[PDB]
C-alpha cells in the first residue's frame, strides 16, 4: 500500500509499505476522511520530537473497519468509526494512575505519526479496537466527524484542565482550530466573558461563532495591557494557551489573577525552555497553577464528544475551511498547513 | 414602613414595621422587583423552619440602594443592585472553611425570611453591602435579573455539585424553576444527553428551551424503568434532584451509574428521613456519591451569574410566566405560589 | 484440589474441585498466607449477595505464582506476590470512566468469593496477572502482608474518600480491622483529633496504637451526644463509617459539620434502606456529602500499600491477634469470624 | 517603642517607632517568642520585593494580647496567642474566590515585614483579631509554637498543593526548615518513599527524623540522575520545591512522572524568570502540573496546626537549633539567618 510519510527531518513524500495486519485485539481500518495537524509540521520541519524514518503521517481520521482480530467484540468489517488520535495501550501502570495519554511513557498514548505509522495510508492499524474505536452515527457528516479525534478533544481538554468556574472570565490565546475548540469548550464549561486572541479574519469570525465575547489583536498594543484595560486591572480567572510561541506563558502569567489557572494545550515545537516571569508569578507564591496536557483519546472520549455533536452542543464544521477529494490530495492538504494561507483553519480530505 | 409578613405558622398579612437602619457596613435597599419562592410556602404553612412572628417574607429581589453605612465603599444611594437570597456574615469560621452558606450555623447564610425580615417590605436591610451586593447592568431586564438571586444560583449549584463530565448524561428530576436552571447549568457544564422529569406542559416547553433532549413523564411507568429503557440498562452518569418527594432519592440512586454523582438542591420539608435503597447503593460500596447544598450567595456569586446573563450564556426570562405591578400584588404573587396554577413557573412583581 | 467452600446459604465445608488453568493473560497462584473477611460471613449466613453453590471462600491472600499464561510478562512461577481482593477486568468502559471497582457492573471488580472461586484453595486463579498482581518484598512478614489485599486498602479508601484536611477532626465509627485501618489512614492523611468508636478492649488498644486520640463507647451515652460534648457543640469535620448498623449513617450525619463529608466503607449486608435524618441533613442543603466505595484493587494499589508498609508508614501486624498454620485451620479461622470472640481482631493462616 | 527594621535595601538596624493602636476589630500584641525567616533575608539584601524604609522585620511570633478593639469578642489582654505570618483582610473578593493569601492583591495576605511593620518590635498590630489569632494551649512550649506561624503552614501547604496519593513517591528539594516541614507534611499526607535533597548534616538528620527514607547530595552527581537511579529510571510521583535556585524547577520537571505534580513553596528572590525544560515537559503536554503558593494564614489555619502539634502528629521542636533569650538578641538571630552557619536550622528568641 501507499502512504504519505515523513522520510526524515525536513523531508516528506509518498512511499510504499506492506499492508498492516491486526493482532487478536486489533483492527485494520480504511480512511474515509482525514485531516492534517499542525503537530506534524512541528515533527517534520522542526524535529520537535526527534528523528524519524519513513513514518506515515497523520492522526485524524474517520474510517471504515476493514478487518478485526479474533478477540475484537464490538466492531466488524464495514463499520464506520471515529478514530481517536490518541490510541493507548490500556493495560499499563499509567492507565491505573489515570493518565492513558502516557501509557508506556510520555506522550506514548499518541501513537499515530508519533511512534506508529499514521492514518495517511490506504489502510492503517488500530490497537485494541474495542477500547479505542467509536461508532460513527450516520447523522454526523464526515467533515464534522473528523474534527472530533484531535481538534475537539484537544480544545475541550484545555477547558477541562482549566477547571473553569461558572461565570468566570477566560482568555484563549491563539484562535486556530484548537483555540476555537478551546473557546467552545470554555463556553461549554460555563464561562462568562471569553476573550479570544488572534487576528486572521476567518479565525476571528469562527471565534465569535464559538462564543468569544471579545477579540484582541496584537496591534492595539500589548495583549497583557489590553486584558488589563478590559478588566480594569483585575485580570482574568483562566488562561488557555492554544497557540503562539512560548512567550505566551509569560503573557498568561501576567494576565491571570492570583489563584487562577493557566491551561496549555499548545504543542510547543522549539526552544530549550518555557519562561515563567518571576515577579508576576509572585516569586513562586501567587497560586498561579500551570497545566499542560495531551488530549484524551480512546473510545469513551470519542463517544462523549460524539454525544456533544449529536445533541448539537457544538458544531465543529465551521473549523473546516478547505475540503478536497482524492487520496493524492492528502499531500496538498498537508502543504496547506505548512504555508498556512490567511483563510485557513482546517482542511479535510474526502476519500469516498 | 409596610411589609408582607408571616404573622405565624399558617398566617400571613401586611404589617407595619419600623424601617431598618444600617450598621456601618450595611445598606438599606428598596426593591424594584421581587418574586416569591416555594420555600416560603413551606415555612409559612408547614412550619418547615419552626414558628415565626411577624417575619417579613421573600428573599428574591433586585432593588436600589437607599442608604449605606459609613464603612460602605462600593455602593451608594441610587445604585441598582442584585441581592442574593444568601447574604452571609463573612467573618466566621465556616467562611475560613469555605462554606459561607453555613456561616454561623446550618443554613445561617440564608437570612431573608429565615432569621431576618425578608424583601417584601418598602425597604429591607443588607448586612455587609460591599460583600453581599452586586451592581445590575442596565442591559438586563428586571424580570430576568430577579431570577438570579435564587433560581439561577440554586439550579446552577445543582450542576456544579454534580461535577459533570463533558458529554455525559444527566437526569434532572423536577422541572420547576430551579429544576429548569439545573437543566441550563448542566448544559453549561457540557452535558450531552439531558433527561428532564416532569409533566406541566409549560415547564416541559421551558425544559426543552433550556437544553433537555428528553422529557420523561411519570405515568409512562416508573421513572427508573423509563430511564433504563432510554439508556439501554446503562443508566445515567449524573442525577440532579430538583423537585418531588423524598422517594426521589431512591429513584436517583437506582438510575445513576456506579461511580456516579447524585446532586440534590431540593428542599425536603416533610418526613423524618430520606431513604437510600441499600442494594442499589451497592450496600454502601457503589461509589454513588450523594451531595446536597444551599445555593451560594454573596457578591461574587451574583457577579458571576450576572456575566452569564449579560453575555447571553443563559436567558432566565423564560422562567417568568406572570408579571405584576405595584407593591400590593406581592400578596397575590405569594398566594399564586401556594395554589400553583398549571400555567405558572415563576411570578414577578415589578414595583418601579 | 480441595478448597473451603460455601456449599449453599448457611452451609460451609471442604470440597474437591479441579485445579484452574490460566488464560494467556492469567496466573495460577498457591496461597502462602490467607485471612477470612467479615464480608464472607454475611454472604454465607445472611445470603447478602444471593445464594451460591460450591463457591470457594476467601479473598485475602499472599501467594506464590505456580503458572502463567503465554502473554504474562512480569510474573513467573516462584514469584511471591500480594494478591488484591479486587481483581478487575481492565478493558472496560468503567475503567475508562475511572472506576475499576465497578468494571463490568456494580462491584464486579470484586471477583474472589463473590462471582469467582476465592483463595481458600490449594490453588486459585488470578485474571490479568500483570495488571492484578504485585511483588512482595522479602522484608515484609506474611502476616502483615496479608492485611494489604483488603483491610488496608478498604480502611485507607475510607480516609481517601473522606477528603481530609490537615489538622481536622475525624470520627471513625467501628474499630474492627477495617476501622483501625480507617484510623491509620486518617492519621496518614494528616488528621488532628481522631475519635474512634467501639468498646472491645483489644480493638480499643489497637485504635490507640494506630492514632486515636479518643475512644468513645456507647455505654457512656449516645455517640452523637458524646461527640457534641467532646467538641463543645461544634461537631467534627469528617466521619468514616466502618462498622455498626445502618443507624450509624444517622449518627454520622448528626455529628459532622455542615460542609463536612461522611465516608462509608462499611458493608451493609442487611436492611432495605439506609436513613438520612432530614433536619440534621439540612433538609438536603447542609453540604454534608455522603460517599461509599468498594476498596481499590489491582497492582498499583497493592504496590502503593506495599510501599507504605515497607517504609514503615503503617504497621498492619497489630491487626493480627491469631496466627494459625495449615489448610485445616482455614475452617477454624473462618468460624472464628462467625462467632466472633472477645480477644479477636483478625486471624491469619500461614500455609508455608 | 523599639523595633528591629530594614532601613533600606541591604540595611538593617534598631529604630524607634510609635506604638500602634487597635481599630475596633484589631488587637495589639507583645511578642513572647519570635523567629527570623530567610524571606526577610531576600527582601533586605536582594530587594526581592522592592524598596522599603524603616520597616520593622519579622513575621513569626507567639505573643500576649495587651489590648483589643471594642468589637473584638474572642480575645482579651493577657491571652497567649499564636499569630499567623499571613493575616489577611477577610472581606475581599479574593476571600470569596478562596484565596485569602492574596486578599487585596498578590501576596497581600502576607502583611508583617511585607507591607506592614512586623513582629520584631516591643509591640505589634494584628488586624482582625477574631479572624487572625489563635489561642495557645499551655501544653505547647513557646519554641515549638513559634514554628507554626510560617515554617509549618508553609511546608505543609507544599504537601497539600502537591495533592499526594497514598503510598506515592515524593522528592523534596531543599531541607532547610521549610523543606523539613515539607517532608513531615508529605508523610502526613500518606507518602511512601520520601527523598530529601540537601547536604548539611543537621538538616540531613532532621529530614530522616521527619520521614525522609533517602537523602541525596548534589556532590554525588546531578540530582536528576541520582533520582533516576533510585527509581529505576521511573522518576517520582511528586516534587516539592522548598529551596535552591530556580534551576530547581527544571530539575523537578525532569525528575517527575508524566501526570505528576510539582509544588513550589520556595521564595525565589532573584532572577528574571524560572525555566521549564520544553522536552521534559512533553512540549507542554506531559500533564506535569506546576503549582506555587504562599502559605495559608488566619485563625483556622493556626488552630488546625495547633491540633497537629497538640495531638503529636508532628514535633516541630527539632527545627529549633538555637534558642536565645532577650529582646536585643533579635539582631543576633536575624544575622544568623544571613550567615547560615552549618548547624543552623531555625533560631528562636525567647522574650519572657
Ligand atoms: Cl472520492
Ligand atoms: Cl463586619
Ligand atoms: Cl496460555
Ligand atoms: Cl497493640
Ligand atoms: Cl519497595
Ligand atoms: Cl473588619
Ligand atoms: Zn494533532
Ligand atoms: Zn428561595
Ligand atoms: Zn473482604
Ligand atoms: Zn517567612
PDB file of N, CA, C and O in Angstrom, chain B residues 25 90-93 95-97 128 130-131 298-301 304, chain D residues 25 90-93 95-97 128 130-131 298-301 304:
ATOM      1  N   UNK B  25     -21.502  48.876  58.041  1.00  0.00           N
ATOM      2  CA  UNK B  25     -21.114  48.014  56.922  1.00  0.00           C
ATOM      3  C   UNK B  25     -22.321  47.622  56.082  1.00  0.00           C
ATOM      4  O   UNK B  25     -22.181  46.980  55.041  1.00  0.00           O
ATOM      5  N   UNK B  90     -19.540  37.438  56.925  1.00  0.00           N
ATOM      6  CA  UNK B  90     -18.340  36.963  56.267  1.00  0.00           C
ATOM      7  C   UNK B  90     -17.160  36.682  57.203  1.00  0.00           C
ATOM      8  O   UNK B  90     -16.213  36.014  56.808  1.00  0.00           O
ATOM      9  N   UNK B  91     -17.221  37.176  58.434  1.00  0.00           N
ATOM     10  CA  UNK B  91     -16.157  36.899  59.399  1.00  0.00           C
ATOM     11  C   UNK B  91     -16.541  35.758  60.331  1.00  0.00           C
ATOM     12  O   UNK B  91     -16.857  35.970  61.500  1.00  0.00           O
ATOM     13  N   UNK B  92     -16.545  34.542  59.800  1.00  0.00           N
ATOM     14  CA  UNK B  92     -16.850  33.368  60.609  1.00  0.00           C
ATOM     15  C   UNK B  92     -15.896  32.243  60.248  1.00  0.00           C
ATOM     16  O   UNK B  92     -15.150  32.331  59.257  1.00  0.00           O
ATOM     17  N   UNK B  93     -15.929  31.182  61.043  1.00  0.00           N
ATOM     18  CA  UNK B  93     -15.036  30.053  60.828  1.00  0.00           C
ATOM     19  C   UNK B  93     -15.525  29.217  59.660  1.00  0.00           C
ATOM     20  O   UNK B  93     -14.719  28.636  58.934  1.00  0.00           O
ATOM     21  N   UNK B  95     -16.627  30.410  57.024  1.00  0.00           N
ATOM     22  CA  UNK B  95     -16.089  31.092  55.860  1.00  0.00           C
ATOM     23  C   UNK B  95     -14.604  30.748  55.670  1.00  0.00           C
ATOM     24  O   UNK B  95     -14.137  30.537  54.547  1.00  0.00           O
ATOM     25  N   UNK B  96     -13.857  30.655  56.763  1.00  0.00           N
ATOM     26  CA  UNK B  96     -12.480  30.187  56.643  1.00  0.00           C
ATOM     27  C   UNK B  96     -12.432  28.736  56.133  1.00  0.00           C
ATOM     28  O   UNK B  96     -11.511  28.369  55.396  1.00  0.00           O
ATOM     29  N   UNK B  97     -13.444  27.937  56.478  1.00  0.00           N
ATOM     30  CA  UNK B  97     -13.576  26.565  55.956  1.00  0.00           C
ATOM     31  C   UNK B  97     -14.091  26.493  54.499  1.00  0.00           C
ATOM     32  O   UNK B  97     -14.048  25.437  53.880  1.00  0.00           O
ATOM     33  N   UNK B 128     -23.473  43.830  55.399  1.00  0.00           N
ATOM     34  CA  UNK B 128     -22.213  43.863  54.653  1.00  0.00           C
ATOM     35  C   UNK B 128     -22.419  44.080  53.150  1.00  0.00           C
ATOM     36  O   UNK B 128     -22.291  43.160  52.337  1.00  0.00           O
ATOM     37  N   UNK B 130     -20.731  45.690  50.825  1.00  0.00           N
ATOM     38  CA  UNK B 130     -19.604  45.501  49.941  1.00  0.00           C
ATOM     39  C   UNK B 130     -19.381  44.029  49.613  1.00  0.00           C
ATOM     40  O   UNK B 130     -18.884  43.714  48.524  1.00  0.00           O
ATOM     41  N   UNK B 131     -19.759  43.131  50.531  1.00  0.00           N
ATOM     42  CA  UNK B 131     -19.530  41.692  50.315  1.00  0.00           C
ATOM     43  C   UNK B 131     -20.770  40.978  49.766  1.00  0.00           C
ATOM     44  O   UNK B 131     -20.677  39.870  49.236  1.00  0.00           O
ATOM     45  N   UNK B 298     -23.715  35.928  48.212  1.00  0.00           N
ATOM     46  CA  UNK B 298     -22.651  36.917  48.204  1.00  0.00           C
ATOM     47  C   UNK B 298     -22.448  37.617  46.866  1.00  0.00           C
ATOM     48  O   UNK B 298     -23.007  37.235  45.831  1.00  0.00           O
ATOM     49  N   UNK B 299     -21.629  38.659  46.892  1.00  0.00           N
ATOM     50  CA  UNK B 299     -21.335  39.453  45.702  1.00  0.00           C
ATOM     51  C   UNK B 299     -20.748  38.637  44.535  1.00  0.00           C
ATOM     52  O   UNK B 299     -21.214  38.743  43.400  1.00  0.00           O
ATOM     53  N   UNK B 300     -19.739  37.812  44.813  1.00  0.00           N
ATOM     54  CA  UNK B 300     -19.050  37.096  43.742  1.00  0.00           C
ATOM     55  C   UNK B 300     -20.020  36.207  42.974  1.00  0.00           C
ATOM     56  O   UNK B 300     -20.053  36.230  41.751  1.00  0.00           O
ATOM     57  N   UNK B 301     -20.814  35.426  43.693  1.00  0.00           N
ATOM     58  CA  UNK B 301     -21.790  34.568  43.039  1.00  0.00           C
ATOM     59  C   UNK B 301     -22.694  35.394  42.118  1.00  0.00           C
ATOM     60  O   UNK B 301     -22.926  35.035  40.955  1.00  0.00           O
ATOM     61  N   UNK B 304     -20.906  36.684  39.062  1.00  0.00           N
ATOM     62  CA  UNK B 304     -20.644  35.635  38.092  1.00  0.00           C
ATOM     63  C   UNK B 304     -21.899  35.257  37.312  1.00  0.00           C
ATOM     64  O   UNK B 304     -21.838  35.038  36.101  1.00  0.00           O
TER      65      UNK B 304
ATOM     66  N   UNK D  25     -11.638  46.177  65.506  1.00  0.00           N
ATOM     67  CA  UNK D  25     -11.554  44.724  65.278  1.00  0.00           C
ATOM     68  C   UNK D  25     -10.151  44.165  65.520  1.00  0.00           C
ATOM     69  O   UNK D  25      -9.895  42.967  65.333  1.00  0.00           O
ATOM     70  N   UNK D  90     -10.182  39.983  55.707  1.00  0.00           N
ATOM     71  CA  UNK D  90     -11.081  38.903  55.331  1.00  0.00           C
ATOM     72  C   UNK D  90     -12.239  39.257  54.405  1.00  0.00           C
ATOM     73  O   UNK D  90     -12.816  38.371  53.796  1.00  0.00           O
ATOM     74  N   UNK D  91     -12.574  40.537  54.278  1.00  0.00           N
ATOM     75  CA  UNK D  91     -13.720  40.904  53.452  1.00  0.00           C
ATOM     76  C   UNK D  91     -13.282  41.433  52.092  1.00  0.00           C
ATOM     77  O   UNK D  91     -13.313  42.625  51.842  1.00  0.00           O
ATOM     78  N   UNK D  92     -12.852  40.525  51.224  1.00  0.00           N
ATOM     79  CA  UNK D  92     -12.378  40.887  49.893  1.00  0.00           C
ATOM     80  C   UNK D  92     -12.849  39.850  48.890  1.00  0.00           C
ATOM     81  O   UNK D  92     -13.270  38.753  49.272  1.00  0.00           O
ATOM     82  N   UNK D  93     -12.780  40.188  47.606  1.00  0.00           N
ATOM     83  CA  UNK D  93     -13.213  39.258  46.570  1.00  0.00           C
ATOM     84  C   UNK D  93     -12.319  38.014  46.582  1.00  0.00           C
ATOM     85  O   UNK D  93     -12.792  36.885  46.384  1.00  0.00           O
ATOM     86  N   UNK D  95     -11.046  36.497  49.008  1.00  0.00           N
ATOM     87  CA  UNK D  95     -11.561  35.578  50.028  1.00  0.00           C
ATOM     88  C   UNK D  95     -12.784  34.851  49.475  1.00  0.00           C
ATOM     89  O   UNK D  95     -12.933  33.649  49.655  1.00  0.00           O
ATOM     90  N   UNK D  96     -13.637  35.568  48.744  1.00  0.00           N
ATOM     91  CA  UNK D  96     -14.798  34.912  48.158  1.00  0.00           C
ATOM     92  C   UNK D  96     -14.348  33.877  47.137  1.00  0.00           C
ATOM     93  O   UNK D  96     -15.009  32.865  46.956  1.00  0.00           O
ATOM     94  N   UNK D  97     -13.215  34.133  46.482  1.00  0.00           N
ATOM     95  CA  UNK D  97     -12.687  33.199  45.496  1.00  0.00           C
ATOM     96  C   UNK D  97     -11.939  32.015  46.136  1.00  0.00           C
ATOM     97  O   UNK D  97     -11.600  31.062  45.455  1.00  0.00           O
ATOM     98  N   UNK D 128      -7.903  42.425  62.627  1.00  0.00           N
ATOM     99  CA  UNK D 128      -8.991  41.465  62.772  1.00  0.00           C
ATOM    100  C   UNK D 128      -8.635  40.282  63.695  1.00  0.00           C
ATOM    101  O   UNK D 128      -8.521  39.132  63.255  1.00  0.00           O
ATOM    102  N   UNK D 130     -10.192  38.417  65.876  1.00  0.00           N
ATOM    103  CA  UNK D 130     -11.066  37.246  65.922  1.00  0.00           C
ATOM    104  C   UNK D 130     -10.907  36.314  64.710  1.00  0.00           C
ATOM    105  O   UNK D 130     -11.189  35.119  64.794  1.00  0.00           O
ATOM    106  N   UNK D 131     -10.478  36.861  63.579  1.00  0.00           N
ATOM    107  CA  UNK D 131     -10.264  36.032  62.391  1.00  0.00           C
ATOM    108  C   UNK D 131      -8.816  35.566  62.233  1.00  0.00           C
ATOM    109  O   UNK D 131      -8.537  34.622  61.490  1.00  0.00           O
ATOM    110  N   UNK D 298      -4.380  33.117  58.907  1.00  0.00           N
ATOM    111  CA  UNK D 298      -5.649  33.207  59.600  1.00  0.00           C
ATOM    112  C   UNK D 298      -5.802  32.236  60.754  1.00  0.00           C
ATOM    113  O   UNK D 298      -4.980  31.348  60.966  1.00  0.00           O
ATOM    114  N   UNK D 299      -6.884  32.409  61.503  1.00  0.00           N
ATOM    115  CA  UNK D 299      -7.076  31.704  62.749  1.00  0.00           C
ATOM    116  C   UNK D 299      -7.253  30.202  62.560  1.00  0.00           C
ATOM    117  O   UNK D 299      -6.669  29.399  63.299  1.00  0.00           O
ATOM    118  N   UNK D 300      -8.076  29.822  61.590  1.00  0.00           N
ATOM    119  CA  UNK D 300      -8.376  28.406  61.378  1.00  0.00           C
ATOM    120  C   UNK D 300      -7.111  27.601  61.058  1.00  0.00           C
ATOM    121  O   UNK D 300      -6.907  26.489  61.576  1.00  0.00           O
ATOM    122  N   UNK D 301      -6.265  28.166  60.201  1.00  0.00           N
ATOM    123  CA  UNK D 301      -5.022  27.501  59.846  1.00  0.00           C
ATOM    124  C   UNK D 301      -4.222  27.239  61.116  1.00  0.00           C
ATOM    125  O   UNK D 301      -3.748  26.125  61.330  1.00  0.00           O
ATOM    126  N   UNK D 304      -5.748  24.489  63.221  1.00  0.00           N
ATOM    127  CA  UNK D 304      -5.536  23.131  62.737  1.00  0.00           C
ATOM    128  C   UNK D 304      -4.107  22.641  62.949  1.00  0.00           C
ATOM    129  O   UNK D 304      -3.887  21.478  63.263  1.00  0.00           O
TER     130      UNK D 304
END
